[PDB]
Amino acid sequence: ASLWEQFCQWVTSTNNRIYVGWFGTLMIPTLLTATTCFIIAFIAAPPVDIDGIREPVAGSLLYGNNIISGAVVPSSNAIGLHFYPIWEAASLDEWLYNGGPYQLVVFHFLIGIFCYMGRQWELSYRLGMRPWICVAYSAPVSAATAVFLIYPIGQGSFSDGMPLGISGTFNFMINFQAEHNILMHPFHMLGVAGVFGGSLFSAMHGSLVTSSLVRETTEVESQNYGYKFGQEEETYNIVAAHGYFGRLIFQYASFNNSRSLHFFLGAWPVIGIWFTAMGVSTMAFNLNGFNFNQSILDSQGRVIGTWADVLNRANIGFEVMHERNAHNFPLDLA
Amino acid sequence: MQVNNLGFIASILFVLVPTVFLLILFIQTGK
């Protein structure tokens, strides 16, 4: 009945079109700030000296970039890991030249997505649901944290963070392959298993449900109209799906329990993305993928190349050309 | 930028033609 109590009831209200919640009271300002600065920067930001060698990179549409090539450029290598808000620049133009929009957008984004995870738990609690949708959402959160926060921290610079753009993302991946051999890292391999399997199982489950729908419609209408929102009854025959799938492979390779099946569907890609996030997070500390260069020698001691050696040649090609003006010393130590 | 001088008509039509198809279909639903 107090005004604070009234505000609390409104914030935690389950009748708002968009749930706010306490986590939302943080999510909304941070994500809105990040979105505004990101759109403005992507459209209009001046070039950014990412590599700190006074060689500004054009990232914005108005400076000659298309949607594919445009990006918000990570902050200058001269900044390193230093905190660089607007009020630490002698002018907004100095802030822009050194890639301040990247720091603002990433920090607000990171806070916003952690709050989004908390908000998912919060609404599940208010709806009397089970609480673990946020656990599944923690996989993409972990991956985003790896590329925007953990990798820069381990490498020592926000200039090494993933650029906020499409071609910027490819640059990040290529450089990452050149310096870490992520393809030959087992955690990336589990991430690929996670995403290939997640798509495989999405296709499998979708196709098996769609194949086993109960006849409810006529041939002139979409079969989707055979389901009514809120209906008691199941819209497909899991028994028929299991008969088909257990004959496609063998009876014991097929689920007869929807709860067990939906758990597997949730767990597989989530676990795979946790592994890949941890892989990126550990190569942040330069614990790289497998090195098998010159592993096979003949009796005289001559190197017999393998596919890993050819991959290494590709990596060396990427490595010698990257940041072509940024290195003064022979070893790329970060 | 020396862009393809046909890029703008192409992008405009690529989006507008399916857009109008969809709008026509949606607005006449229920006749």
């Binding site: 549409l61 298309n66 949607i67 929102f229 809120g230 | 703008f8 992008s11 989006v15």
Partner: peptide
């Protein structure tokens, strides 16, 4: 002027998002 094209298609996407959320078909229990 390609910048105008890019901003316009991006704006169409965002406006579609707004309408799809604010004005969606209301799910009803039947």
């Amino acid at each position: 002027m390609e910048s105008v094209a890019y901003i316009l298609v991006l704006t169409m996407a965002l406006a579609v998002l707004f309408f799809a959320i604010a004005f969606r078909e209301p799910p009803r229990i039947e």
